[model samples]
Target: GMKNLLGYSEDYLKERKGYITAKEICNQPKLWRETYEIILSQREKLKSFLDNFAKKPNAKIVITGAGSSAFVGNSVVSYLNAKENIKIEAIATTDIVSHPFYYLKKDEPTLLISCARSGNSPESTAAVTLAEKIVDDISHLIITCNSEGKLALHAKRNYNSFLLLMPEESNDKGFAMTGSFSTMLLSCLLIFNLDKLESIGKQIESISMQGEKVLVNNVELMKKIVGEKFKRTVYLGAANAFGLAKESALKVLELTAGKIATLYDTPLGFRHGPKSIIDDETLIVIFFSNDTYAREYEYDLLKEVYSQNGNHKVLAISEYEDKLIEDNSDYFIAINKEEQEYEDDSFLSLDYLLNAQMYAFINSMELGIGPDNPCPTGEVNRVVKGVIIHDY
Candidate 1:
């Protein structure tokens, strides 16, 4: 039944033009600004709860979601862990549902951050339920698009819970998640460090707009290439952006239904041993940040990859670029931002995120798969399905 889903004898793609159009719509600055407003409106309540929970110094923060939602949590772990001086782990609801004891610690002040575009995911709810059962000191910050679902409603009824509803449109109608993914990501950044929101907003707005430009320019680029027999896919980044590398690689694997085996590592980490995964048919997506110190190292790796005969299609996505590496990269997509001289730390996270959304959308269409339902073969869905959570 899933055989002819490709709908073509040879490799074909949806074309990059539509991505540019969709990207423009996706980048509307107000989308993120609105998200900020929603989160801030509830800040007092969130702060009261978190502040009380903070007294326990031993409190553990576990951010989770299934699929792309989980990826958002994956991308923010480093940022939150460093700033809060708390033990933060990005556990997937899938993992918690399948094996709860391994991840949930007993007697620790546990604050679970669950990211659900819609609060209906079975595993997400089940994970939260299990955490509450196993951990005596359990608090939840449920970030979701739906304010009326079980997750959100549960947050309302319990002092241990808090919910931040994202911008309305983020509750997507498209098969693949685009804006929903980025905004939730932005939400996490704001939570990790709130002082920088005003400055970060401009850059984020630029990303939202430039993201649309990206889709317009290369929307279908990945989709068109998806049917190509890629032996491996390598994603690279440095600092917080490295989380995006891991998240992007997972998206391709999930959307492609394992047709493409993928790997993710920091630019420097790739040289350790994983670089051997690169072959003639690999597609390498590198996230370059404007951060001066880190970019130097990222460039050195780019040079080495070229020295190896540039065996694969290399793509660079960033807000800033260097001519030396841009010359060798297969694609260099820039995310435009204001001239503010703050730092690239914030931009790095957003740029990597938008690129992931583009690639996933393209891959979905490339395989003639529904963007709304990429895996029509019944493998995965918006909320994970059919997992049994036992009362332990």
Candidate 2:
């Protein structure tokens, strides 16, 4: 009755102290598909909610969350903003809590899109209250996994709010966010792209196939790479367009309990002195934008790094080969090898992320740290305890 996750049997994973993490990381594909279905069912309501605010003069959409949840807003904002004429911005709940007036204007008709795994973070709920207190014209689109969580419960009570709950399975049990992150991010992509939701289903199917490839084809490669000694790794991508770089970096750092020093930066930003992070023991993984023009800059960065001739190995993940893989990288992972269908940044980000999740899980296990709860002492937590919601 036991199933394996990330090439390890259920029994083996349980004994190794990472059954939950492995299962969560590996289960993302299923959760992503389910997330799409959930969004599909809510298409009417989502459109109604969006139209309610999007039409208002000077209307604003702010994507808010803390940490991993916060990164989702950053990841999706560029793509969402480019597609819709409405003003779209990603502001963290942490930032909003600290300076509500900076973000929540009394006159700006604002739609607060809160992203969360549990929706129970102190900042998650606090930001909601702060918005109501500050913004005269404010509505909420609460995207959360846990229905019982503070965000969901608050949304239920508020007439002006619409709660977009993820599938029950996305409530991740692992210390680090996995299924929760992917599902929440997917929900945002689906929510904003409601204009063509039906066509998106085909893309989701293709993305799921790519994710399975990571499981069947790429996971084995991770163990071998992680087995080799490496001190640090950095993830790079077009941050404004798709926040894959930040999320990927966090996955490795959190799953490894910060034992693996990690950094996330835009490809252009990396060369701004941050490139000093590169060393013989470092693994350099860059996420290339599917956009042809953006890929040129990413290619330059990869080529420049390779020219240095260091002991560091370069890996690139993108939608197409374009010979960048063969010409520059030690490893090249492509999500699409066939006829191009979905060229959107949001869709590719979902599939490309599986690689980072799998890599982190294997690295965590390799270090003898429990991937499910790397910080066994509870200094850090799955739900982030010890956060107090201060009164405004």
Candidate 3:
């Protein structure tokens, strides 16, 4: 059944030039399951390889990727740092390509985790080259969707390099990165917690079902959201959710080809001036935290935004169907829908991401922009072009 991919039949999706985009977004739950199995198959190798780094003192980890790929690192680095008791850094490949000196050091033993959809972006490969040139003891952990891409080949040839290839369908053919981002993000989470594979696998199964629930049940709600035709939207999240907020904002901004303005900030940070972006034309979407301590602060912000009475719509998503959240925001989504409150951001980030992707896809279709290629004029290519590294 070429089922309703976010409320559209197969024919409509094909005609609208969103067939690939729709397929990828709707396929994530299955892809996530396949992603878990892929990692499970390689758990031994991943653990042994990481075992080397864990033993090294003062070893630094820098997760790097470009664009949506970079956001994977942004989403998990902070959580991993606190959980693993190691200092993890999230540096974009774009930044490393342009300015290597500021981020990399000669003596620091660094593990560069490169997350990429295609693994072929110039910045992706360039940053890999720069890391090797600058750091004396550097190891590469390339988690990418495409096995045929350059970074994959780099991993295959180098002894110190290890590659974790994602599911076959993850190399997204669409203009935006959907499954590519989430699957890679899941791979990183799995790799770091190889010990919790059993429990994490169970969580993956639950989130997979929840992901499907969002794709199947939330279609009309997302379309209804686009029906508002708001000219701007804001995404709010705290801690690692902030990373997801940034990615969520980019999804709408890029898929709309910059036609709609998008903003992402922490719930509290939104008050320190970023909140000024709201108006009657805006839709504010907050990804509520599950942690009891953080959720309280998030509630304050949601109440504050709703109290403004600016005619703007506020949609708050939480882990449970809470009355406080339901009453505070104009609209609400319960990711858990039934209910650790996971304490780890990756779990909800994966769920909240589906909502953002669906919103961006439907919103793009409503605006008459092709979801598969938002910029068909070549101003913006799926894999970026015209970038030169100045012989670094």
Candidate 4:
């Protein structure tokens, strides 16, 4: 059925371009289930490692990564921090590389939750090196997809480090992080919420089922949404949804080869200065919150955006089928309105990501850019290139 959607043969998919991306995107649901099982199999090891760092009264958890990897940290920290009662912050490798003194502290017992897809970025390794040098007591919980990559290799060698390598298929062959993103995100969540594995497993099952539905049922729907005339796109969400919005905005920006302008902000943040980006040709996508309190703010912004009557269209993706959610937008995609909301908003993000990714994939094809390798002129390699780490 997936092969029929693009009408490309297996041979052609291997020889031509964009097939890796399509395969990765469509395979995510299955991979997500596999990821959960893999984590379950290693539950004892994960629990021991987490127990070591989490019990300290002054222990600080820093979730660090670069690009989409960094967003994984942003997306997961809120839930983990609240649940674990540990002080957690999402700091980007790019920022740490530039301003190490500001982010790294000498007094705290730090657990660096390094999130990486390829784990090959110079900054990723550099951030580790810098942390080791500056901090008095630091341990690493390196979460990555590629076992052969530098960060994973370093974790294997370092006694203080423990590596959680993702499923083999999660090492995305495509240019973008499709399966890799969700799988890594899930890995982080599982590590912290392992005590509730049974509950988490049920949530993963629900999310994975919804993800499958989106990939199979909404290919045409996403195509039509992207087909509508728009030169710029903005993504809005509140709380944890904002992190997904940032990632979603980047997907569109990257897949479209930067031909389309993209912006991401919280529902309230949009009104400050980001709202100026919206005009008649802009497509605004709101990632609705399942939390009743947050949902009120999301709906308020949705109504405000609609009242302005400036955007080319307003679209929403949510877990519920509320009348206001349906009526305030040009399009509403409810992945599982009948089912209960996933146990956490972070879990909801796994399903919501498919919608954003599908839109980017369709938009990439429509723009005549190869989704597998969007840029061909030695710019934007699958693994970032030519970044030389400096001694900080």
Least accurate stretch of 10 residues (summed lDDT) in model 3?
Answer: 337-346
Sorted by TM-score (best first), the order is 3, 2, 4, 1
Across 106-137, the per-residue lDDT of candidate 2 in tens digits comes to 88999999888888798999999998998888
Q: Please report, in order, the local distance difference test score of every candidate based on alpha carbons.
A: 0.69, 0.83, 0.88, 0.84
Q: Count the backbone clashes (under 3 Å) in each candidate.
A: 14, 1, 0, 0
- Select the stronger candidate by lDDT from 1 and 4: 4
- Output the number of the lDDT-best candidate: 3
Which 10 residues in a row give candidate 1 its minimum summed lDDT?
A: 2-11
Candidate 3, residues 105-182: lDDT per residue as tens digits? 898888999999988799999998998899888999989889999888897666488888898899999999999999
lDDT of 3: 0.88
Candidate 4, residue 391: the lDDT equals 57
For residues 169-277, write the lDDT of model 4, one tens digit per residue: 8989888898888898888888877788888798889889888888877776676787874799999877777788889999989988889899999999999998999
TM-score to native of every candidate shown: 0.83, 0.96, 0.97, 0.95
Rank ordering of all candidates by lDDT, starting from the highest:
3, 4, 2, 1
Superposed model 3: Cα runs more than 4 Å off = 340-343
